[PDB]
Amino acid sequence: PRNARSKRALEKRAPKIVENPKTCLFLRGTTCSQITQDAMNDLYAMRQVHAKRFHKKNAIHPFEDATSLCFFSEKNDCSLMVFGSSNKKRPHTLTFVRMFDYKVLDMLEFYLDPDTYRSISQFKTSKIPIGMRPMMVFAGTAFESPVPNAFTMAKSMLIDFFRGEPSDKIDVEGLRFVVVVTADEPQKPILRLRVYGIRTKRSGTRLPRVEVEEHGPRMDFRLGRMREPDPAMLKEAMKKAKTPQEERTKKNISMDLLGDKIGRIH
Amino acid sequence: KLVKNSAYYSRFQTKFKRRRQGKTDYYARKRLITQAKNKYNAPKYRLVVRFTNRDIITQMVTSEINGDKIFAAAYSHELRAYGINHGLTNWAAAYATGLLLARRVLAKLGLDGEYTLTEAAETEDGERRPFKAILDVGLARTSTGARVFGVMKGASDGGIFIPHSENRFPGYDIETEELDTEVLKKYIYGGHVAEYMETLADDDEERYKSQFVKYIEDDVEADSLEELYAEAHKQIRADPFRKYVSDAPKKSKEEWKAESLKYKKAKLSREERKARVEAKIKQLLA
Amino acid sequence: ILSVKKNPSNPLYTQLGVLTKGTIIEVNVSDLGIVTASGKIAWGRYAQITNNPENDGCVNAVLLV
Amino acid sequence: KAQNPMRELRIQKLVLNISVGESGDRLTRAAKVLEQLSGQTPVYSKARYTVRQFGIRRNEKIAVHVTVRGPKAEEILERGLKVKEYELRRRNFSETGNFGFGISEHIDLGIKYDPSIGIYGMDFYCCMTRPGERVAKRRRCKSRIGASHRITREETIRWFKQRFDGIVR
Amino acid sequence: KVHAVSRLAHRIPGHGQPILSCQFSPVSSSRLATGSGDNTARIWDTDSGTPKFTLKGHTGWVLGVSWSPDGKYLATCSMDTTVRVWDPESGKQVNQEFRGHAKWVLALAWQPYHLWRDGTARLASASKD
Amino acid sequence: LPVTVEKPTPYTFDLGLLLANDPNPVNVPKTTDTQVLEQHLASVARDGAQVLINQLLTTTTITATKDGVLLTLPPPTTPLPREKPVPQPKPETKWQAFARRRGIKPKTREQRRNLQYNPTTGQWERKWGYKGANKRGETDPIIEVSAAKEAMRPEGTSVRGDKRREIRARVKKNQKQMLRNQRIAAEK
RNA sequence: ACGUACGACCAUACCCAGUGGAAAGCACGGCAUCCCGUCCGCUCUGCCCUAGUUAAGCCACUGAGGGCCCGGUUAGUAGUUGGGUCGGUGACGACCAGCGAAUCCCGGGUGUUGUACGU
RNA sequence: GUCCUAAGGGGGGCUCAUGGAGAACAGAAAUCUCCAGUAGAACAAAAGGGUAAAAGUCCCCUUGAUUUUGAUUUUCAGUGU
């Protein structure tokens, strides 16, 4: 990288101890329905700040070959991906792809129910501000599987999607919206995605009384094909790096409230 | 060879609609709304300042996913309620409109049952925080003495915390890095206009009459402008929501719907379009 | 004295902390009551030694402002 | 609708061009002629590419020009037409409605001979416009001029004949 | 309830020397008076952060500015051994300067408004003499 | 109205992610009415939002600053995959291995500064780069030249380019060593 | 419904041309003292909102030629994996499955929409 | 063999290659004007979707050539501020 700007871009794409917030690439196949496009638009609107959008048709079938997906991940530095497609067998499909080191870590299909889908514009409410992260509620007994399955995978993927940016502090005025994902264990269980705006009322106590109002979109999914990670790749992915600001604990050595280093004798 | 061919039309990528209309700088908008020093998930406000030929438009705006929201708006044609009837686009009117917007924002917030989480979790050592907003000038040039900073000065004096420096106010001296508050006071109270009125009345009486025909007709002398604008500032601070009715024709919303539908031209139906196509085919055959 | 920053004759003299004429030292300026533009208290600054301490028996310095 | 006062033709600008092809004293003298004729400081133009046949190199000042608007453009165009005896050719007028010509000696415009400067020829180019030209020039909401508001070659020829009482052959 | 001030409202220059006294008007915060070592006092409009009047006439540092309790007068005391009274709504000196102090006049105190008698106000000046 | 939700199983939380996990089953009614279905779903959302807001307001430290009323959040605890592997130390270059074997200490930042004091001019000057001391004399008016060196000099060349020649030679050798180190590290 | 200011989708919105536009609003417009910027008050900036004018911008409608966007069809077909399961020594030929196109063709369309202030 | 107040950073303004039509010398190729121009230029990389009121290009400001602090990370320290 001769150019300083290209050097900055390379350093941004370099692996780090404290990683950047993940970027999501939104793209569609050669055949994609308008319902699937509207679903993709709603998800992009919820995740605008850390997303990139493709606009062409891509002749990609992810469960056959994902070389093009890896190429797009490497080129755009996107580690989350939402891929839309349609078929006779699968009329409205959203394929969530999560990458690790520009290679496919895992994949999951979501089949969208067309008759119960409502977009964000179908609810006449105030909407979430751009860049604001919502809170998350995961409800039901389908997420407590002792063995890893499609529903635990979907919980992990949706947390990664709606995660936003990590922060040690938050304003109390930034707690006005919640994404609720409901799914129960069992013919196929339905995973329901809802978004609600939050109102607070006086209750005569210190704690306020919460009320909810529907924000959109209204989403119903059936979980389909699932590509699970290689165990070694998963181990490398769930390895946790330690920040230099996390000190290594030494035996009989501590720091007092004045910052003096204090030793213990016995 | 033809540059504009079928391949060119198929390969063409359109810009954003407001970029095509030349109204929005999306490069600046992205940094105005999606960039933050802190990540406390807090809402952000911008003071949008726009100028037309005859009016000044000031808005307090949040940015939501399906479109922007307006928290408050003040227009310079509303200054007729406070006594300013001339020069509704000048620097003094810009200051007064910014002051009006600031007072309306504070009166709407009550800084002049449902309750917020801030009041729910307020501590013992908690003080009132000022309303904060950032300036959005759009495509206007940000040079020294521009009226956008007059709107900004009016709003900041009205009580909105707007982060700013002073090197673009009228009277700023660039070599000495100092601001002439006498020139700033003159521009706030419209003394540049009054000095122009005196200068034109001394030099070119005909051009004076043509340029200030409405001032003379309404008997607004140059020496009374400072008092007029000061009294307008006092009235704005006293009653920020004074109602002003214009001389335009007044109907109800349904009456305006009917009046506009009387002049709307309806889109042709498929049957009429096919009839016209058949008539054209018959005319071509004949 | 907080530290010896730069003895002009030799980096070894700096490392040994020799206080001679022209040496840059870091001093504690809490008593002077210096506040920065952000409201923080500045308690460490740089001074230059203006005398010969080996001849005088004292260290004299001027704050670099 | 052609009798609307907002469709009235007028001169937008007049550009005076001297392409000496060589940098230095000759270009400085040509800039002196342009400054003395216009009343304002001229513009030095640099060569885009290197041509060994013309003896020029890239980024080298080889030309000078002045843009003049207002009644000053009208009076300078009047002097140029006095030099050309109010005679123009049909090929001079462009398809977009502008026109121009050239003179070989600037002395015939009314400039006294100074031996330290010399004789320079000049290119006159006049652009024509209608009111409402700001639509394509302003920064905000810049748009295209509509087709019926554009100026044609026949219209500017007719305007030239009616205004300056010249002839076009 | 008075809320704590947290930020700069205005920074207004105009004085050529350090400010030695400051006081708001008793009527409201819109009018502020300062007295400086450039031998002048100044009235400021605090709503727009602009200068309003410049009271000149002292030949020493204005050590004190003091509003009358009703707000209709401004008294200045200076190192030139004198006291002056000004009309704050027009910036003009009222009558003549008060003469009789041998040395610098350091402090002023108006008589309280409910104690004024004989159709006048009374002003006390403390001096170095 | 109550501000407490009572359920057979307690909620779990990750306040770093603003996440509430409800382990209780969502008994969705087996009806065909969208109104009652979304009413039950909104009730579940209401309970989850209520307990999340209660946990945030009661179990986190609250600080009132000029920015606003802020809650201190714990670091996130839900395990999520990284996008890229954890950075690792680079393979040792030939110089680094040689310095480790020979006990050669890294130079200090003051020792490696691009500044030196020229006695003869009494000025401070750069050692390298633009107008550095390594190019000293290339623009001086007069240069004494050796007769033997001028005789051995190639035709057309000048003594004014000798220092740039030595600089180009040194740079070429350094980049060759750097490319060899890069190739070996890529092989490893 | 129409207009304006910020917008969201970002061609159904783009490229070319014609016709019409009440009210208000936009706009063209007029003037260069002051602030400010140019070779040129062209642009930018300041002052007027009076006067002219819907000519253009803008809006609506229409029109070709492209382009673009939906839905069906292609078609569960080519193709690709499976002795998969039956024969065939085997390779392979059917059958069974799992994934799964595109061309052609047909039909429809040429902008919807949020907040605020107004007509 | 020649030249440079260095590169870099921030902000602001502007739009390119090319084609058509015009302008004394000027003629395929000098400069100037208008129209059209999805980038077909330039700069980076090696897109299967890099960048157009910019990441291009010119102005303004900085050019201070490798800051300070750390009980923290890793390595080292017979010269452990």
Q: CA-CA distance, F143 to F153, in Å (whole number)?
A: 15
Contact, B112 CB vs strand G, < 7 Å? no
Contact (Cβ atoms closer than 8 angstroms) between residue B181 and residue E12:
yes
Residue D156 belongs to some domain of the structure: yes
Q: CA-CA distance, A12 to A35, in Å (whole number)?
A: 36
Instruction: Please give the angle made by the CA atoms of B229, B230 and B232, to the nearest 5 degrees.
Output: 60
Q: CA-CA distance, E80 to E105, in Å (whole number)?
A: 8
CB atoms within 10 A of CB F140: 8
Task: Give the chain E residue nearest B178 (alpha carbons).
Answer: E13
Contact (Cβ atoms closer than 8 angstroms) between residue A47 and residue A129:
no
Mutate which of B52, B139, B141, B142 to disrupt the D interface (most D C-beta within 10 Å)? B139
Residues of F with Cβ-Cβ distance to B126 under 8 angstroms: 64, 69
SS3 of residue E126 by DSSP? strand
**Way it was determined:** cryo-EM
Resolution in A: 2.1
User: What is the CA A130 to C1' G29 distance in angstroms?
Assistant: 41
- Cross-chain CB nearest to B33 (options A130, A165, A202): A130
Q: Closest by alpha carbon to A191, among A151, A226, A162, A163?
A: A151
| Residues forming beta bridges with residue D142, ordered by sequence position | none
Task: Name residue D156's amino acid.
Answer: T
Q: Which residues contact B103 (CB under 8 A, 6 or more apart)?
A: B112, B158, B159, B236, B237, B240
Q: A170 to chain F nearest CA, in Å?
A: 5
Domains in chain D, number: 1
Report CB contact under 8 Å: F25, A241: no
Q: CA-CA distance, A83 to B67, in Å (whole number)?
A: 26
Q: How far is CA A183 from CA A223, B182, B190, in A?
A: 11, 69, 66
Residue D5 belongs to some domain of the structure: no
Domain that holds residue D132: 11-164
Task: Name residue A152's amino acid.
Answer: T
Q: Which residues contact F37 (CB under 8 A, 6 or more apart)?
A: F28, F29, F31
Q: At what angle do helices B181-188 and B191-203 cross, to 10 degrees?
A: 80
* Minimum-distance residue to G109 (CA–C1'): B270
Report CB contact under 8 Å: F64, B38: no
Asked if residue F87 has a cis previous peptide bond (ω within 30° of 0), the answer is no
Q: Which of residues 156-175 of F touch strand H (CB under 7 A)?
A: 156-158, 160-161, 164-165
Residue D82 belongs to some domain of the structure: yes
Nearest 10 degrees: Cα torsion A124, A130, A131, A133:
-10
Query: What are the backbone dihedrals phi and psi of residue D94, each rounded to the nearest 5 degrees, phi first?
Result: -85, 165
Residues of F with Cβ-Cβ distance to A175 under 8 angstroms: 18, 53, 56
Task: Show contacts of F158-167: CB within 8 Å, 24+ apart.
Answer: F163/F134, F163/F135, F163/F136, F163/F137, F163/F138, F164/F135, F164/F138, F167/F134, F167/F135
Burial class (CB in 10 A: 0-12, 13-18, 19+), F171: exposed
Strand H nucleotides with an atom less than 7 Å from a protein beta carbon: 1-2, 4, 6, 8-9, 12-14, 17, 20-39, 43-45, 47-49, 53-56, 65-74, 76-77, 79, 81
Q: CA-CA distance, B38 to A199, in Å (whole number)?
A: 25
Q: Closest by alpha carbon to B43, among B127, B113, B116?
A: B116
Contact, D160 CB vs strand H, < 7 Å? no
Query: What are the backbone dihedrals phi and psi of residue A93, each rounded to the nearest 5 degrees, phi first?
Result: -125, 135
**What totals of helices (H) and strands (E) does chain B contain, helices first?**
13, 6
Chain F: partners with 3+ C-beta pairs within 8 Å: A, B
Residue bearing tokens 């350094």: F174
Domain ranges (residues) in chain B: 17-284
**Domain B17-284, classified CATH 3.30.420.100, yes or no:** yes
- Cross-chain CB nearest to F62 (options B38, B40, B121): B121
Residues of B with Cβ-Cβ distance to E43 under 8 angstroms: none
DSSP conformational letter for A164: -
Chain B: partners with 3+ C-beta pairs within 8 Å: A, D, E, F
Contact, A102 CB vs strand H, < 7 Å? no
Strand bridging mode E74-78 / E62-67? antiparallel
SS3 of residue A69 by DSSP? helix
The gap from C-alpha F167 to its chain's centroid, in whole angstroms, comes to 32
CB atoms within 10 A of CB D65: 19
- A138 and F CB contact within 8 Å: yes
Task: Give the chain D residue nearest B138 (alpha carbons).
Answer: D140
User: What is the CA D60 to C1' H3 distance in angstroms?
Assistant: 16
Find the nucleotide nearest B21 (Cα to C1′). Answer: G58
Domain that holds residue F6: 1-75
